[PDB]
PDB file of C-alpha atoms in Angstrom:
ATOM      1  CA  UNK A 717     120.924  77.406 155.988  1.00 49.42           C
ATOM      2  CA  UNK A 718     117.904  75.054 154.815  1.00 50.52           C
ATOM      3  CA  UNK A 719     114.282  75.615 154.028  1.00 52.67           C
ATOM      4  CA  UNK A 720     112.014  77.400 156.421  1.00 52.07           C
ATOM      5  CA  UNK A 721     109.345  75.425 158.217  1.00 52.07           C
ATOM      6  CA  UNK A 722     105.384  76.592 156.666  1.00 49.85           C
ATOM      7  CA  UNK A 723     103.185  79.551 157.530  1.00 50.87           C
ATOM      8  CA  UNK A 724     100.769  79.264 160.087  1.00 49.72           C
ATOM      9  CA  UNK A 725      97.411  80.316 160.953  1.00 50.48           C
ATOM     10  CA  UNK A 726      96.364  80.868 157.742  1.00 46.86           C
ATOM     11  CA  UNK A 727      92.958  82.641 157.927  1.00 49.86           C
ATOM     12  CA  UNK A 728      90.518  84.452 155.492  1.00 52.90           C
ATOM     13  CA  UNK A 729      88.249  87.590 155.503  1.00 49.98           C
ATOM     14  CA  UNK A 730      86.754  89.755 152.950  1.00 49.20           C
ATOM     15  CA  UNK A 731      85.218  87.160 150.680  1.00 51.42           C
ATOM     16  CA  UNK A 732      83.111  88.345 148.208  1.00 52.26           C
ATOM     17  CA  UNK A 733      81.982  86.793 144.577  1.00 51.27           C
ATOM     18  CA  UNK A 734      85.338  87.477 142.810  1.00 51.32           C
ATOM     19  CA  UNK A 735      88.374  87.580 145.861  1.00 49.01           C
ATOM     20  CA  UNK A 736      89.252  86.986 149.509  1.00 46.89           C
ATOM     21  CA  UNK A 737      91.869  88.090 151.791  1.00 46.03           C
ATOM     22  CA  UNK A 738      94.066  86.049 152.982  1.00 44.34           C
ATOM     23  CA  UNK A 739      96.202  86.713 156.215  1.00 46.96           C
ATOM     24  CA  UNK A 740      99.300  84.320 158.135  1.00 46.81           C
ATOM     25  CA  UNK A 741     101.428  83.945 160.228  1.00 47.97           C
ATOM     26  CA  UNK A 742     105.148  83.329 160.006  1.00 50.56           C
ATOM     27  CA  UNK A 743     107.468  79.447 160.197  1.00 51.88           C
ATOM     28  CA  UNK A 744     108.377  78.912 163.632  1.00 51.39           C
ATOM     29  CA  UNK A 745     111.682  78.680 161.827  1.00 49.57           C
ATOM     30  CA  UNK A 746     113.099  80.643 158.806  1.00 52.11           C
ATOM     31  CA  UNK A 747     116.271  77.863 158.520  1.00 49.26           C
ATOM     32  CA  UNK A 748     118.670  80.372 159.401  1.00 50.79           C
ATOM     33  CA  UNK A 749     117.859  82.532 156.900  1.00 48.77           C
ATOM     34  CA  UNK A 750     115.138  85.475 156.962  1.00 49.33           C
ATOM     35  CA  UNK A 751     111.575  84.702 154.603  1.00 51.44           C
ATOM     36  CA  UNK A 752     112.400  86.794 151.611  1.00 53.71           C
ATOM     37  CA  UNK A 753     108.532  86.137 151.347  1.00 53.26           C
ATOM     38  CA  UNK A 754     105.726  83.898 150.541  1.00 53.57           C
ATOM     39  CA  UNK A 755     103.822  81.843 147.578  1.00 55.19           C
ATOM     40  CA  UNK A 756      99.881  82.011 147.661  1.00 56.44           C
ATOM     41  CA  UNK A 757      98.520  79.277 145.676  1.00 56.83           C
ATOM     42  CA  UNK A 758      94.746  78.265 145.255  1.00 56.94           C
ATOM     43  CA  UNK A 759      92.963  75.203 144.088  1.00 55.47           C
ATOM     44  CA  UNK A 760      88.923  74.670 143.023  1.00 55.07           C
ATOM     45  CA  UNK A 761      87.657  72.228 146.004  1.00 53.43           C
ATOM     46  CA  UNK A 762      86.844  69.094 143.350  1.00 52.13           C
ATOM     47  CA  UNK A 763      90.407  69.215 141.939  1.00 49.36           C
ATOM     48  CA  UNK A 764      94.491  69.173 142.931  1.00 48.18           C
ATOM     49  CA  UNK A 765      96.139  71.011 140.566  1.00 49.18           C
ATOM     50  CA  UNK A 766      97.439  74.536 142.517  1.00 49.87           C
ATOM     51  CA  UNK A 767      97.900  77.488 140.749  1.00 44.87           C
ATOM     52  CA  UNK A 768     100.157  80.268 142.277  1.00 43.30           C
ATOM     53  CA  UNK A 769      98.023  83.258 142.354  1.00 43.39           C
ATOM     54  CA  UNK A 770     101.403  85.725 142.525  1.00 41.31           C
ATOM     55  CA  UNK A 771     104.365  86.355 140.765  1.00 44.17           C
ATOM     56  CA  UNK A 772     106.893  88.340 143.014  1.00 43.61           C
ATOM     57  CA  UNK A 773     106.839  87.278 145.994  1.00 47.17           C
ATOM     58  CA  UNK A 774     104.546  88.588 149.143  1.00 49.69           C
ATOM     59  CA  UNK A 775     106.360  89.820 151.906  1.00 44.65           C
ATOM     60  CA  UNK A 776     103.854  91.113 153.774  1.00 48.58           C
ATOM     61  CA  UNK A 777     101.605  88.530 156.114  1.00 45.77           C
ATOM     62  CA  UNK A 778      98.436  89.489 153.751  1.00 47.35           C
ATOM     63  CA  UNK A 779      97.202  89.038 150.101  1.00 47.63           C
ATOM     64  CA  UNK A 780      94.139  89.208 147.812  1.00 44.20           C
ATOM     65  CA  UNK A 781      93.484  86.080 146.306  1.00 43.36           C
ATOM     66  CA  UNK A 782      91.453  87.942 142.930  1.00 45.44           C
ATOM     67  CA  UNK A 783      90.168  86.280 139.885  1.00 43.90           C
ATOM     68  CA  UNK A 784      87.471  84.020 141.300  1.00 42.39           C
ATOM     69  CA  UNK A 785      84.837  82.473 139.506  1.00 41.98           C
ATOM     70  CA  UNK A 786      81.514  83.442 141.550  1.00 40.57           C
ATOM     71  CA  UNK A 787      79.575  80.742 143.412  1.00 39.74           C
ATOM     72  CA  UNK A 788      82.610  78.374 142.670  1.00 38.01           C
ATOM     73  CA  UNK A 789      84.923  76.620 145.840  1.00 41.31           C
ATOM     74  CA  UNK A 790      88.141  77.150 146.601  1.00 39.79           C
ATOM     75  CA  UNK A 791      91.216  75.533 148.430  1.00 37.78           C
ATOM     76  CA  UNK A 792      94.077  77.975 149.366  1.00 35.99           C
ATOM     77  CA  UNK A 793      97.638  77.563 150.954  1.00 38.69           C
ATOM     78  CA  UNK A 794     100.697  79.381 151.704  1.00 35.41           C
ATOM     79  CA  UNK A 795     104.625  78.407 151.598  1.00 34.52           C
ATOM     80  CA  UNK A 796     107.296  80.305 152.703  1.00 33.51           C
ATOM     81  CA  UNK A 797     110.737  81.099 150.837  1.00 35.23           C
ATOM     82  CA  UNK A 798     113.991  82.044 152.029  1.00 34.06           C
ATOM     83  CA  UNK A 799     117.372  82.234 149.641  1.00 35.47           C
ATOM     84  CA  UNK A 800     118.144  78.445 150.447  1.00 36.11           C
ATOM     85  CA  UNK A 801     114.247  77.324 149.488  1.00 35.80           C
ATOM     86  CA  UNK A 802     110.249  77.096 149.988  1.00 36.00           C
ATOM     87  CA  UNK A 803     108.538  75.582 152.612  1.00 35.57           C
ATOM     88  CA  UNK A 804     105.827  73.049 152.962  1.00 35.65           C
ATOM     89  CA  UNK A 805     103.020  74.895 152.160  1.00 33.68           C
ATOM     90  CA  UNK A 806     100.395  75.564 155.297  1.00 36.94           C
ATOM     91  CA  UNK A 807      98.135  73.850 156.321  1.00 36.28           C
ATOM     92  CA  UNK A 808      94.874  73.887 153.613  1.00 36.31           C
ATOM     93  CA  UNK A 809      92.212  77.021 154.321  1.00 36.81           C
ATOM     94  CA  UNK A 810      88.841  76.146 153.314  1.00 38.63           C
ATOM     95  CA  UNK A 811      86.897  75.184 150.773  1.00 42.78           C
ATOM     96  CA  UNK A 812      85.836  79.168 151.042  1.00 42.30           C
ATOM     97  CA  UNK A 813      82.860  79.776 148.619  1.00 44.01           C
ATOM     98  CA  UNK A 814      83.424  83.088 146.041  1.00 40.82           C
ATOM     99  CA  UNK A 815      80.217  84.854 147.211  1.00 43.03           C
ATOM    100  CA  UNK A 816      78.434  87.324 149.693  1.00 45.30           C
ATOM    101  CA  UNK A 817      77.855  86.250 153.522  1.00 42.82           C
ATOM    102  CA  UNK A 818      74.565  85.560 155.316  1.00 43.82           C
TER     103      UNK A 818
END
């Protein structure tokens, strides 16, 4: 068994001042081995240094990012782990701004 391939179509919806939801798909391959479940990391715009927003492991296809500073910028991906590893994380959603649509 080896690593699974990344997540795709990460989207977002539900942004307000302090969260967003974030929703994927799963790796076109799992490695041989089924996607115990997934690592959401997020990163402000300006910077690269990604901090994993959750501790066990998601193993549904949806998460709340939560802690977000308002009006601030954010970067978000998602990487996939089975027992043999984690996956290249996704592809990189946004910047997505922490506040209230138009």
């Amino acid at each position: 068994s080896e690593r699974p391939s990344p997540p795709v179509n990460l989207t977002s919806s539900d942004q307000t001042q302090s969260s967003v939801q974030l929703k994927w798909e799963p790796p076109l391959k799992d490695g041989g081995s089924p996607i115990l479940g997934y690592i959401i990391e997020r990163c402000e715009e300006g910077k690269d240094n990604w901090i994993r927003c959750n501790m066990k492991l998601v193993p549904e296809l949806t998460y709340k990012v939560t802690g977000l500073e308002k009006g601030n910028k954010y970067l978000y991906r998602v990487s996939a782990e089975n027992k043999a590893g984690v996956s290249d994380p996704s592809e990189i959603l946004g910047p997505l701004t922490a506040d209230d649509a138009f």
